[PDB]
Design a protein around this ligand. Structure first.
Ligand SMILES: Cc1c(O)cccc1C(=O)N[C@@H](CSc1ccccc1)[C@H](O)CN1C[C@H]2CCCC[C@H]2C[C@H]1C(=O)NC(C)(C)C
Lengths: 99, 99
């Protein structure tokens, strides 16, 4: 689909069998979701943006269906202000910026 | 143009006739530029990123050419590690997300 930016580019995702809403974020290198439980082992990591750094749980090779498109990759879980789908997964679904 | 997301979508922007590299960021509601001594009045504002809020100076109706496309709007200046072009300006240059 083609998405304009007059409003936040929010989309529904399926992860761990549960539906969630997330923001398609070209400015984020990684995908970061609010605290939640996910199958498998995770590794402690830290990521930063504006405002500073936060501690997250790194889960690898996690399947996520984004607006009907399949992706399987790294998902960071932590106290992020909101769910963000970063470039690591945006590239998997063939998402590009156009103007 | 079409910009893929294999690497950070950094483009050249012109503000004050000067050139800077900035990130096309669909996840940002606002445009936040690294500290720069812009002239004129401004209003204090707090913007929140992944690691918390930072204080910025809000400048209104500032001309900004993004990768050759002209825009004009609100630009926030503060201690961000990277220049970010948010939806407030991305919409002006007709930028969309596609997949
Ligand atoms: C700058 C800005 C605004 O002016 C208004 C609203 C949000 C933001 C904002 O920082 N949005 C961010 C998403 S994280 C997010 C946080 C809160 C609400 C929605 C999204 C940016 O799109 C992405 N953001 C762009 C950029 C911000 C300056 C530092 C270098 C990158 C860091 C990157 C980022 O945070 N990456 C993570 C991997 C940690 C997620």
């Amino acid at each position: 689909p083609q998405i304009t930016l007059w409003k936040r580019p929010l989309v529904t995702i399926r992860i761990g069998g549960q539906l969630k809403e997330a923001l398609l974020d070209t400015g984020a290198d990684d995908t970061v979701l609010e605290e939640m439980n996910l199958p498998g082992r995770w590794k402690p990591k830290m990521i930063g943006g504006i405002g500073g750094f936060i501690k997250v749980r790194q889960y690898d090779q996690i399947p996520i269906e984004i607006c009907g498109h399949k992706a399987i990759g790294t998902v960071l879980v932590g106290p992020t202000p909101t769910n963000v789908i970063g470039r690591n997964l945006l590239t998997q679904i063939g998402c590009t910026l156009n103007f």
